[PDB]
């Protein structure tokens, strides 16, 4: 089918089947420095996202189901609109202002279960 970003205009539930397509595309001394800086940055950006998935308990996954409830104030829409009408670019704009709140909540719930799992052992 289409490769990298081919699903960009597709709906969210049509997309999200192509997650490995995008994940794999994230990987004279003056020209040397410019190229190394570009390569070092690609590595650093990749690792920051991986660390973040790790602290949320989603390490090694592309689709991670969490234990944080959705607040209707973040987006009062049903699943039919979100997954069948909207694209990911549109969604990202709609909930931009709630991203940091959601991220904080994801970290907190992982810390709590990580500890509960120790008490049960």
């Amino acid at each position: 089918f289409l490769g990298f970003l081919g699903a960009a205009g597709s709906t969210m539930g049509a997309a999200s089947m192509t997650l490995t397509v995008q994940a794999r595309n994230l990987l004279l001394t003056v020209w040397g420095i410019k190229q190394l800086q570009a390569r070092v940055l690609a590595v650093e950006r990749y690792l920051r996202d991986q660390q973040l998935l790790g602290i949320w308990g989603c390490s090694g996954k592309l689709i991670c189901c969490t234990n944080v409830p959705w607040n209707s104030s973040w987006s009062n829409r049903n699943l039919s609109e979100i997954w069948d009408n909207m694209t990911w670019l549109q969604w990202d704009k709609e909930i931009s202002n709630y991203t940091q709140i959601i991220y904080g909540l994801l970290e907190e719930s992982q810390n709590q279960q990580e500890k509960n799992e120790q008490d049960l052992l």
Binding site: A8, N25, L26, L53, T66, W88
Partner: protein, 432 residues
Amino acid sequence: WVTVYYGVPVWKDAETTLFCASDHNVWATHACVPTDPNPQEIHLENVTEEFNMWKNNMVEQMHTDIISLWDQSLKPCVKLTPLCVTLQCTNVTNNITDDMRGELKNCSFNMTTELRDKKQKVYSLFYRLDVVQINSNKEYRLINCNTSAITQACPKVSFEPIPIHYCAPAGFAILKCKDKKFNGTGPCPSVSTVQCTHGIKPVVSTQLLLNGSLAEEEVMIRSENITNNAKNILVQFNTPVQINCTRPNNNTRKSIRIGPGQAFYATGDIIGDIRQAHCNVSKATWNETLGKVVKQLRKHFGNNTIIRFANSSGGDLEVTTHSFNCGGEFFYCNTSGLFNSTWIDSITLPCRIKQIINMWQRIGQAMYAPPIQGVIRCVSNITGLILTRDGSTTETFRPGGGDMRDNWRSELYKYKVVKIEPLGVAPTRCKR
């Protein structure tokens, strides 16, 4: 309810460092990544993206990269400091035509030798644009002597504008607008993702854009602000106009040793007759082309408006003329024969030649262009114009230029660089 996805097809505008790739150059040689013989392009269905060619930092990057590569290619070459001497000059009158009477000067001088103890008397030909009369009526100095050091370009490095492909680093992508009739700003449908840009030739010129790409359907007028007379108009042709340029003088070159391992390349006597350099533009083609340009200008200025073309305003030769580099020599051609009309064989444009070149718009770094032996003939495509509007029933357009960024903006207008942001969250209906 909250679920986390990684690998989501989302992006944001971004500014990054792009690297060069390509299939004895001034620019890209071995410090350039070999290209992919089968590069990818992915059409994005249902994607509308906003582009703005006037805010495209790929242009600023290219400008910086070509200047830096230019300097690195002069850094190891011969300094001509010993050449800034008093010259004793007379006129070249041997088989000289009227068109060049007084254009070439025969100058003698006392040059250094391999040995510090000895001097040599040598002579060479210079163009009048390369020298300044001082004081003794035959005494001259080179034009750059009171401004800057001058170096000689190494005569092994060509100036041929071999194309460069710009490629994005991982995590970034280049989006291309394929929408025909795209005027440089606003949204456009028909966006595709590419690994790299097409090959863009770093052709350096003023007034006329040479050897670039053509418009897909019709002549297009692009500007930052079409109603601002302080802004330039870039005109892209949908057909080329062929231009044939030449320096019809069989030159010879001589090497003067000036030191232990260094030599100056001087112009020797001209073989045969001495005639003026010039460029030929087919008149009918130019007239048809200009036809199309006016038809499109009227869309912005009125279809009952009188549109006049006029030659350039006064100022520095590097701006008022059509500058280009072909065959290894720098030409300054007079375009008043192209821009002289109300509304809308061959047209011959006389040209001047210089050996001492101040590149870009810098002061302090001059270069000497070694002469080229034999006769130079160039054939190239005019692919567009840079116009400035002079300004209640008529408008006057004149040739403009000198800011090299306008010559790259015309090729990079289709590209945008974005950053990929693979994480996202959404509601779903599952629970860890």
